[PDB]
Amino acid sequence: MDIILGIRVQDSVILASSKAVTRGISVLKDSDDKTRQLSPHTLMSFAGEAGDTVQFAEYIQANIQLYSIREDYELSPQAVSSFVRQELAKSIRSRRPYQVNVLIGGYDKKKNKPELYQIDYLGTKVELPYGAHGYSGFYTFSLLDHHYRPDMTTEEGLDLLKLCVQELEKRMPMDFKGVIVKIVDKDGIRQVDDF
Amino acid sequence: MDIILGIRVQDSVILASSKAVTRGISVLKDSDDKTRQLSPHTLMSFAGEAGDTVQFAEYIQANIQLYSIREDYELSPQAVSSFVRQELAKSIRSRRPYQVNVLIGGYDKKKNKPELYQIDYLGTKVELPYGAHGYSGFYTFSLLDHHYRPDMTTEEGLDLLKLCVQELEKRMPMDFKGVIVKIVDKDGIRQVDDF
Amino acid sequence: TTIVGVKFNNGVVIAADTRSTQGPIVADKNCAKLHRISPKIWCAGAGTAADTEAVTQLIGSNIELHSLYTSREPRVVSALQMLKQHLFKYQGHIGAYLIVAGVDPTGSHLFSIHAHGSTDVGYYLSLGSGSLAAMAVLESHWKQDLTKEEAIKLASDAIQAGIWNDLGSGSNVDVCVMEIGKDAEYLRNYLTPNVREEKQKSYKFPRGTTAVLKESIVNICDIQEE
Amino acid sequence: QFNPYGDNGGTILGIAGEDFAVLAGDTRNITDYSINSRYEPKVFDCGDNIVMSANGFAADGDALVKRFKNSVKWYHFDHNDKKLSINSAARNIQHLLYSRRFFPYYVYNIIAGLDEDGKGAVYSFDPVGSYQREQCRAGGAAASLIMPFLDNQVNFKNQYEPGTNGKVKKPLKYLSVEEVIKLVRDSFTSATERHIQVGDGLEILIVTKDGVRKEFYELKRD
Amino acid sequence: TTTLAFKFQHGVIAAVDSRASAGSYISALRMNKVIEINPYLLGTMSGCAADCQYWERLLAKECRLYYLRNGERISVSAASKLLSNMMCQYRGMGLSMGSMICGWDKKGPGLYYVDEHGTRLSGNMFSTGSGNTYAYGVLDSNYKWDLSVEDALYLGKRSILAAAHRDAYSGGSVNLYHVTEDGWIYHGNHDVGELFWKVKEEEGSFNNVIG
Amino acid sequence: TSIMAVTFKDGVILGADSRTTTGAYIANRVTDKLTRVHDKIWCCRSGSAADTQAIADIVQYHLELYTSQYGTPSTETAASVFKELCYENKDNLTAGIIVAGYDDKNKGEVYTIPLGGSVHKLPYAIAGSGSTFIYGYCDKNFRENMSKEETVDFIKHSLSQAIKWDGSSGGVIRMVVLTAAGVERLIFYPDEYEQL
Amino acid sequence: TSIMAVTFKDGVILGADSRTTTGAYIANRVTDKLTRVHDKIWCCRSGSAADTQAIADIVQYHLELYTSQYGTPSTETAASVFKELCYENKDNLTAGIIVAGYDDKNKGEVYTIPLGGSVHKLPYAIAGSGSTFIYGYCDKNFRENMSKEETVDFIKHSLSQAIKWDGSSGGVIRMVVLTAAGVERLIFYPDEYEQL
Amino acid sequence: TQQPIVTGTSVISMKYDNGVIIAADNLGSYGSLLRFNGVERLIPVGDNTVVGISGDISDMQHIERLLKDLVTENAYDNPLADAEEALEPSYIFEYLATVMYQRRSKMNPLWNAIIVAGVQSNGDQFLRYVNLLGVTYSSPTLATGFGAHMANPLLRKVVDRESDIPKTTVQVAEEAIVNAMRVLYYRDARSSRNFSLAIIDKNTGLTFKKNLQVENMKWDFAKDIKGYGTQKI
Amino acid sequence: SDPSSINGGIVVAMTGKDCVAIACDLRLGSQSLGVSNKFEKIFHYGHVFLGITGLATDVTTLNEMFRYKTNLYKLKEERAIEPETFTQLVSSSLYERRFGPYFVGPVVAGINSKSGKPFIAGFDLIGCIDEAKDFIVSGTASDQLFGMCESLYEPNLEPEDLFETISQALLNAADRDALSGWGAVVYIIKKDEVVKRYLKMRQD
């Protein structure tokens, strides 16, 4: 798929992901949710080749959910991101690699800190205050470099995110049909229904 | 460029053309007018490879304007369309062909009839009640086939045209930044400033 | 195509089949592959059909003008030389493979010529997709000092070999005999061994079977008086 | 580089009647512009009142027929000499063809027989296994020549009743075996004229409740 | 091909064309591009006819086994997913199959789009095949949730007609289906030749065409 | 193709097979590969028949025109005209030509002109696809100032082996003898040369 | 490469040049292309050195094991083992091998195994890039039941010409004589064979 | 997948009233080089079958061994190996055809074209073709490679259809085969003068003729042919 | 990509008793997309009819070109051109572009005004003439037309019978071709009257 953004503020992580799905020359769907909840305080958005994205995401989800049941314990965002990276680094040298880029947004309940990890299909992991995949960063990073502070509120994070989407909507040739926004904080995961 | 539409109603021809211009991954302009007035009652919209479109359009414009001054007389839309077709049919077997598709909308003052001609870069001319170039017809022709009558008013033509643009905006992956609409009738050429 | 050329006692004979193809489809079932360059110089062509005609008509035109200029009857070597120099110039892009034969004041002649401009002399020759089927017959039955009637038989037998055994060849046999001191006789459809059998049924329709929308008279006449 | 496929030409034709079915095919076998055989049978009696023909690449066609005949044999062994119905044979062949989805049998396959209600049936396949029951089907080299003729003369397409002028169609009256064989012979005579790979001979297999009968007719050998 | 399917108040409509191509040659005028998996499940077809038939008939095998083991009818969500998982095993091997899984289950009416890439999308309306853009134009401008069964059947029928007309590789005939909670219902085979002229007169559309 | 030209006491002899192939099909089994460009200057042709025929026709034209103006041309002069064509049009030609002629002053001379357009004056020369198989035989058996009968036997035996091993070569063995006495054509059939 | 094996009255003689090339560079000018697979069964190698060495090593292993179990193997048996390797691995090999050996029962025998993996029993055999130039010479000069000295001269003259014309061939001429008397190695240097 | 190296050219055959005839030249070509001049490409199997093979010679030698092993294996625990349960031409052919089609299906073909000629138990003539693709066909006349293009036309003048077989004698059929071999020597660049011929008759059994030569050749007319057009001398 | 099958279309011509017939479909497309259902492919220059299939730009171009050439022919010769002569003009004009051809499949049809003899002819894109007695076909459904014409045609048909035969040959061939259809026109030609009929066919 196309655009996935992420921003880590004071007390939460915010993930924005496009709604469009295109087959051939036709847009089949304009309300697609490009994300999966891995655990109550960990969310993963994804973008890449058709089919591979969801298959990979659901496969990761199943593994983390299995871990949670076995240990009766939630893995830290850092631990989950490392597991995901290894699966992708394992995948890149396979017969047919999984062509998927992800952002992992989580709230670490132990450290009481939000955390955002960016991982590409090669297995290239980086922890960031804000991140993006594909061409999304080319348009948005200049705004984020300028406006981002680490002490921002969730509301300020959403306003800076609106500005990023507006810039994308102005200068990108592709119509990605807006974004679904989700917030990850101490209380868990929730969706912003009006954006 | 991307989308150009045309519709011939009772007493006028209406041409709609996208406003977007893209270089690389960036949309440079969102207010571009993809049209040239060939004569007071003849308008030509165009779409194709970068640069070639405007060069060809302006070259045609200069030739028709030269004819008008020489004879003190306006060529019929049919005559102009034939001249344009010959230039394109001449062009296709050149060393470097001009990669331009056009719609020619004109009002014939002699016959008191609106006329719409569709010509592709090969020099393939057809007179139509409604027409389009590229992928535009794939989305819009089904609506036009259903809703079009030959006795439609200009206002009804604009409403049917809005429905076509709305369908394009829903099902096309590319953001073409809306359209500039122009009407060609007995009184000449005018632009609809609110669309 | 299957085409052949056979020399005999007092002249030369050429022959050809009458099938033309568009891949595996038969476009024409009674094509004419025997072309006239001059009255007593005929050629048979295989390969690109338009090229064999065009190149034949061009050289035939120039040969006629040459004959008029020189006040002499045209020679086969002249047609041969003009053809090969033309074909050579286009480096095989004019796909004309011809058998050229004729009689002139010098005698009787038989040449083959390829698309790239190479010529060849012989007493018996064959060209086209059925050239191997025909040449098998020629190599089996040809001899020195053939009569006119023996040569026509050999030629048409060679073409038949192509008709039956080669899918690129079929239908009828055309022949042209060029004897010294005589007019050349062109025997169109000398053999007709492939007539279609009667159909089992007539597919003539009842009048009114086809649905019609509009009728109109077409004005083919010029603008009228009064 | 080695090319495992080839084209042996030929053309086949299946027509379903009210209480009978025919499967016809020319007897010519070819490579490129050469003739291999003027009489090489292409339509086979496979048992259980079923006839079959695999047109295209002869080696793959012979292998498929050979396998289906074998499938019929094992159907009797495994299911108490039960008769293999034409619909069950069709489905079985789909699975034989899809076995090689990634190295296909390069053949257009047709089978004919009678359904369980005694009516005539023809089934048509593509090289990878898609099948469907039809009334009329020509397959092979001259399939595009023959099919339009059958749409016209079997299903009365584009034919209307005189006087009405396009308002009322020609009614779909059934065809007799004698009428069908005329259309088959005229189809192959016409195909032989305009297609170089078709000719030499025509072998027709007719299927009725009484059994499988053969008829042979000569064709032009050029 | 052109296929479409959409959810509405009284279940789901499914409409398909009937043409089959072999390049420019029309190999079939009357092909069934729907599969009755069970009395409450339908499957549309677009792409390689062989792939569509084999895998959806194999899906029907797997849906029947589900009923025998669990003593309960399979959901549309689960059925669509079994199919998408089959596609993922032959991922990259060259299959060509675009299909909608239509049905009624405990959650009400269900509609899923599945393709050869393993894509699986839930939605109220879908259209696949070479002529899907033409069908979407008619659907998008006339679709409502508040449609009557009579109007809904006509919409899907009319949408295929639109595509059959313009798209060269769509046509032949229209096959209609209506899925209810009592099961699906076949609403006939409609020749496009006859339907076109009928619709032109009654609706007044296709003014550009002479008849 | 198998072609050769050999000088001897009284002049020079050209020799060649008669096979022309289009792949594995023998298009002509009685070809004449020995071609005359002047009264006593002949050439042996190898490579593209179209190219070698076109060239030899042009050379024959040049030497006919030379003779009209300046009298009988030398064999060296003929070889130069061949070379000038083969060298300047090397990008569009595939021609391997042996030139052989007799003067009264220079006697028998042999020039070979391979693919590039280079010229090499030699006592004897061999060329064509079948020449590869007789480099050893010809080198061992060639002598200078042989008699006519010895030279004919040398060419006959040599081409006999070339034909034996090369599929592109075969048919009859044609020869042309160039001396003061005149121009003699010879021919040797399979039943004669195969049993050598 | 230029290799050959010739049968005669008292047995068989193998012969070869000594040049190994990597393009136009002579990597080795004193190569030993005559290799022993058994006491009186030797082979001449042509093609890929890696492939022909690997094969000959395997064959030597098979015949050593054959001898331990079943006694002295025939020359035909040795040729069969070569063939079985060359034929079954033809897609990954480039090896042209001549096999030659002496029995008391069968006397001198020669088998050639070209690229495909086919086997051909012959009176004499030639192979390698330089063999092309001596097909004519060898055919004309070979006789059956020659003496040892005649056969050595035949091989010496033959390879002399192959070396003369083939750039891929050269150096010294090595020979191996296989008779009842035993195994004799010979060597002939350029100054000897070049002046022939 | 491979390419053929040392090759054998045309194999030609036909039916006659009491049996079949088959013939093939004794050449093993190495591209344009006529490398091997003593190669037998007709291989008898028992006293009732002859297999003629063209194409790759190494693959031919492989097939030759499969057949030799087939005879050995048929004799195992078979008291009627030289009588009722002897190998038939139809058995030998179907075996080869099974092998050829399997090899092409593994994309590792035997690069050959094979004609199995023989006479069955009931006196019926057997003549069938198979090649590297596993393609099989039967006809009154059969030929491989160039023979298909040049020999078949000549042999079909003798036996154009099935009804012409009883009318064709062995003297006429042999004459036709020998003429065809001459024509191939004139016109096939990868052919030789020397060839082998085999006759399998239902009465007189298997007659295998070796070291045959093409004779009565026409070359004399070559002396008159001069130049390529305009040359007179 | 293939210029001869981008726009699609078909033309067929037949001879009858003292009459000829020529017919064409009306479709013009951009591959799968149908653009026009009014693209007539038959033109006439006096009493000589020309049908052209293939690349539409070249069809339009050639019509304008032969109109040009026939108008000049008439001014100089002081008479209308005949079918046999026009056929040679088409062949000449096509071959002069031998190495940059028009991607077309022309079909000539007409009656000689002097001899009264019916005449039809077809060409390849490069000028080779196919002068047939029975029928000529051209287009993307040429294989289909060959099968229909070869089976339905019989010689010496009357105008009103010939109409039915050619109409059914065209209609049923077009219904087995994706790139042909969308309407059809048939010209029935006699020595001094010509009728033009539009056929009713399926619009898919």
Ligand SMILES: *[C@@](C)(CO)[C@](*)(O)[C@H](Cc1ccccc1)NC(=O)[C@H](Cc1c[nH]c2ccccc12)NC(=O)[C@@H](C)NC(=O)CN1CCOCC1
């Ligand atoms: C449109 C017609 C687009 O072509 C549809 O998608 C249609 C879908 C369909 C058809 C029949 C059953 C189920 C679904 N597709 C085709 O007809 C398909 C198009 C096609 C052709 N080659 C393709 C390659 C990849 C993707 C699509 C391809 N055609 C076929 O599948 C052809 C090969 N099959 C048949 O023609 C099968 N029938 C021929 C007549 O006899 C019965 C079998």
Ligand SMILES: [Mg+2]
């Ligand atoms: Mg990264």
Ligand SMILES: [Mg+2]
């Ligand atoms: Mg034939």
Ligand SMILES: [Mg+2]
């Ligand atoms: Mg359509």
Ligand SMILES: [Mg+2]
């Ligand atoms: Mg050296």
